[PDB]
Amino acid sequence: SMKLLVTGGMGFIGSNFIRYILEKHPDWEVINIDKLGYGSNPANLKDLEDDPRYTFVKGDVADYELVKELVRKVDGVVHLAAESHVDRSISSPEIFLHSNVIGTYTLLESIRRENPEVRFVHVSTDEVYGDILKGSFTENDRLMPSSPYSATKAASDMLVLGWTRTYNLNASITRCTNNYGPYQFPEKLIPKTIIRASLGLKIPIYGTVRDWLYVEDHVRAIELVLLKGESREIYNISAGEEKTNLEVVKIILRLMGKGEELIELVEDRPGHDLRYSLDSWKITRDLKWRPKYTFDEGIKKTIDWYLKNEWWWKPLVDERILHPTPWKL
Amino acid sequence: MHSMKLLVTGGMGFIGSNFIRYILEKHPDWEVINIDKLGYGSNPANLKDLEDDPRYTFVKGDVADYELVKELVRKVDGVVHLAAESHVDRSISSPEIFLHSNVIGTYTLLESIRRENPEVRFVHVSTDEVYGDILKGSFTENDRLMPSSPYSATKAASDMLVLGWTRTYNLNASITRCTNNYGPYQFPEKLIPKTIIRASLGLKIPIYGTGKNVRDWLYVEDHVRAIELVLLKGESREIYNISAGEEKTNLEVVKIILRLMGKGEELIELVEDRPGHDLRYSLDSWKITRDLKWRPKYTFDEGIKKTIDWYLKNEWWWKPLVDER
Numbered sequence: 001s002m003k004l005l006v007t008g009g010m011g012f013i014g015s016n017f018i019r020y021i022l023e024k025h026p027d028w029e030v031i032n033i034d035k036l037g038y039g040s041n042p043a044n045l046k047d048l049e050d051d052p053r054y055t056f057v058k059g060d061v062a063d064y065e066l067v068k069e070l071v072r073k074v075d076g077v078v079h080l081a082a083e084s085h086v087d088r089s090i091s092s093p094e095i096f097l098h099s100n101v102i103g104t105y106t107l108l109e110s111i112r113r114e115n116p117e118v119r120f121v122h123v124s125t126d127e128v129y130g131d132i133l134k135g136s137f138t139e140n141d142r143l144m145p146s147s148p149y150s151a152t153k154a155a156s157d158m159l160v161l162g163w164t165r166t167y168n169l170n171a172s173i174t175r176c177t178n179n180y181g182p183y184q185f186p187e188k189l190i191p192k193t194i195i196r197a198s199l200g201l202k203i204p205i206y207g208t209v210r211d212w213l214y215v216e217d218h219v220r221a222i223e224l225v226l227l228k229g230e231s232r233e234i235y236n237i238s239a240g241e242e243k244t245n246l247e248v249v250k251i252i253l254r255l256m257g258k259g260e261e262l263i264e265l266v267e268d269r270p271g272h273d274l275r276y277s278l279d280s281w282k283i284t285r286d287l288k289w290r291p292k293y294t295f296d297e298g299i300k301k302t303i304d305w306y307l308k309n310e311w312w313w314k315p316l317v318d319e320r321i322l323h324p325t326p327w328k329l
Numbered sequence: 330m331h332s333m334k335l336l337v338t339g340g341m342g343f344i345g346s347n348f349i350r351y352i353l354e355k356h357p358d359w360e361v362i363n364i365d366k367l368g369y370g371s372n373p374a375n376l377k378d379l380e381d382d383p384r385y386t387f388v389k390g391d392v393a394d395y396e397l398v399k400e401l402v403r404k405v406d407g408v409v410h411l412a413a414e415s416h417v418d419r420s421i422s423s424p425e426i427f428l429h430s431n432v433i434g435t436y437t438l439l440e441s442i443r444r445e446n447p448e449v450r451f452v453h454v455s456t457d458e459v460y461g462d463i464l465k466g467s468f469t470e471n472d473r474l475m476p477s478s479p480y481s482a483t484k485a486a487s488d489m490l491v492l493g494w495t496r497t498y499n500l501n502a503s504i505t506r507c508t509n510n511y512g513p514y515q516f517p518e519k520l521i522p523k524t525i526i527r528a529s530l531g532l533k534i535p536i537y538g539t540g541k542n543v544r545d546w547l548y549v550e551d552h553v554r555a556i557e558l559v560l561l562k563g564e565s566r567e568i569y570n571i572s573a574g575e576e577k578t579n580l581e582v583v584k585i586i587l588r589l590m591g592k593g594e595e596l597i598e599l600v601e602d603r604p605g606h607d608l609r610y611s612l613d614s615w616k617i618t619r620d621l622k623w624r625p626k627y628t629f630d631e632g633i634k635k636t637i638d639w640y641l642k643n644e645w646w647w648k649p650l651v652d653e654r
């Protein structure tokens with residue numbers, strides 16, 4: 001038995017985490033605090049809404065008065081809440097400083113002021129390290145954020161490290177690569193590709209890597225870090241499946257029992273030239289974490305989910321996404 | 330780069346004041362605008378002697394005050410960011426002021442730069458405390474951070490914002506991380522000034538815990554020289570560690586001072602206190618030495634003698650700063 005406070009639970013990874021957690025732990029309870037902003041989708045958890053072990057609290061993690069009350073009553077806290085739209089972070093960084101930095105600060109304060117013994121897991125990104133042409137970053141390498149989004153995520157990581165040592169908290173930090181799977185919004189590469197291909201639409205590919213991690217595997221890692229991770233430690237999480245968009249697309253089509261005629265290579269486009277790579281040996285060695293699904297198995301499960309849940313993504317797709325020739329406008 | 334106008338934040342502080350005096354003294358056609366909120370660590374007397382110089386102007390305000398700082402940032406050619414809440418113990422007691430000044434303050438200044446003067450030369454001044462403890466060896470700019478207090482955590486958070494903003498808005502900015510400064514104008518509460526003052530009064534010397542804490546000691550003037558070098562020749566998006574290579578335990582520092590002052594090591598009495606303080610801090614400053622040719626102009630031996638002398642000759646300064654404690 002363990003009561004968990006999951007922030008940003010109405011989002012992509014948060015929802016997957018909550019469903020997984022309640023399914024694997026009959027006696028656990030979850031309180032989901034989500035502000036219902038960018039990326040949130042109540043539909044993600046509508047079938048669990050009334051499960052007695054689940055409670056939804058609409059609010060901002062930056063709301064100390066509200067957050068302290070929730071932190072006071074749980075055994076663990078899994079922090080997924082954040083603003084993560086890069087281009088949006090470049091236009092209006094304020095949004096990111098508030099949710100990513102102030103929000104994490106507020107959670108840390110509520111934890112050390114109300115319940116310093118609570119188990120805290122801070123979820124972060126592989127983007128904090130910046131790009132790398134060859135090799136992979138370990139948790140002992142410096143950070144080099146290239147956007148307000150990653151800079152604010154990086155800033156939040158630093159506060160967690162500091163508060164943990166200052167107030168002797170029981171907190172760990174996780175950093176993962178690109179997630180894919182159920183409940184990911186339609187314009188993301190993999191979902192967009194599956195949707196468009198099922199509709200016989202051309203899949204653009206600008207000018208012929210990134211590590212791809214099946215969301216459930218990320219979820220399993222977080223669970224492991226929650227129950228066995230050591231305080232004051234950062235844990236990189238990666239599947240070691242670095243592929244280019246063309247590679248991803250070719251595999252999706254194959255697994256959809258199709259041909260590659262849908263691939264339309266157009267002229268190249270800006271700022272998609274960087275490689276991100278995480279060395280996840282630490283978590284492998286210490287917590288024995290290993291991916292449970294291969295890229296093929298994860299994509300196959302992702303294909304099946306999107307084809308059977310048109311009810312979910314359909315309301316979310318616009319016109320850019322279903323457009324015959326989107327690479328033109 | 331001649332005729333350069335500078336906005337110095339936190340200029341009413343220990344390092345800030347030393348920096349301002351040095352720069353105005355060294356560059357006859359430069360100008361300085363000092364913005365300081367007059368909070369902890371502030372002392373107007375530090376610059377009372379040049380406060381009327383035509384090239385100097387003081388502005389009372391917080392760097393977190395966007396409307397006020399934006400106007401100053403727009404008209405200068407360089408920004409040296411020193412302002413910050415830098416007291417470790419106060420940060421543990423009440424971290425809020427540290428989040429505000431260190432994180433919010435830096436964020437606001439960064440916004441002023443990107444929006445009103447993206448071409449200004451910015452130097453963000455930070456600390457060796459961001460890397461945390463290290464038993465053996467030294468940290469390079471390529472090593473992870475591991476702040477152990479709210480003070481160093483918020484300073485570390487500020488460093489990260491600077492890196493991200495610089496790459497996002499193509500700014501001309503660098504970060505500096507130095508070790509323990511010592512020298513003229515440091516408050517009596519600090520180790521070296523306190524030891525000198527106590528010793529000059531035949532009073533016993535309070536060392537903390539066991540005084541085995543290891544720190545690199547950098548003469549404030551060598552630190553400002555390093556800052557000047559980074560300002561004028563440092564590369565954007567680069568971090569520069571600054572260390573003297575004078576690592577000593579607190580006990581060692583005290584014994585040195587006593588010897589040079591003519592007192593006995595019997596005045597030494599360890600008092601116990603050690604919450605959020607760390608055993609050893611050590612920075613590898615090879616980068617700045619190799620690229621910018623920076624090296625300490627004074628050894629610790631020469632620096633501590635200049636310091637001892639300054640305090641004995643300037644009681645007028647620390648007199649009203651000494652409390653009952």
Ligand SMILES: NC(=O)c1ccc[n+]([C@@H]2O[C@H](COP(=O)([O-])OP(=O)(O)OC[C@H]3O[C@@H](n4cnc5c(N)ncnc54)[C@H](O)[C@@H]3O)[C@@H](O)[C@H]2O)c1
Pocket residue numbers: 007008009010011012013014033034035036037038039040041059060061062079080081082083084098099100103123124125126153176177178179180
């Ligand atoms: N999606 C990925 O591939 C990926 C990769 C690496 C790291 N991450 C990290 O994992 C975490 C979860 O991201 P996600 O992909 O599920 O994104 P998401 O955008 O789908 O959802 C974020 C959720 O958090 C909520 N939220 C945002 N700010 C909040 C605030 N201040 N208070 C309360 N709720 C708030 C939103 O309303 C939303 O439900 C983030 O911290 C992100 O940085 C995601």
Ligand SMILES: NC(=O)c1ccc[n+]([C@@H]2O[C@H](COP(=O)([O-])OP(=O)(O)OC[C@H]3O[C@@H](n4cnc5c(N)ncnc54)[C@H](O)[C@@H]3O)[C@@H](O)[C@H]2O)c1
Pocket residue numbers: 338339340341342343344345364365366367368369370371372390391392393410411412413414415416429430431434454455456457484506507508509510511
């Ligand atoms: N003293 C050291 O040994 C040392 C070592 C490494 C790094 N540093 C760094 O050097 C810088 C200067 O520190 P210092 O030692 O002179 O400390 P200090 O405490 O003596 O002075 C700090 C100054 O900044 C001002 N200030 C604080 N917050 C402000 C805000 N929001 N707006 C405007 N002014 C503000 C104060 O009023 C004060 O005059 C800091 O960034 C610190 O982190 C100092």
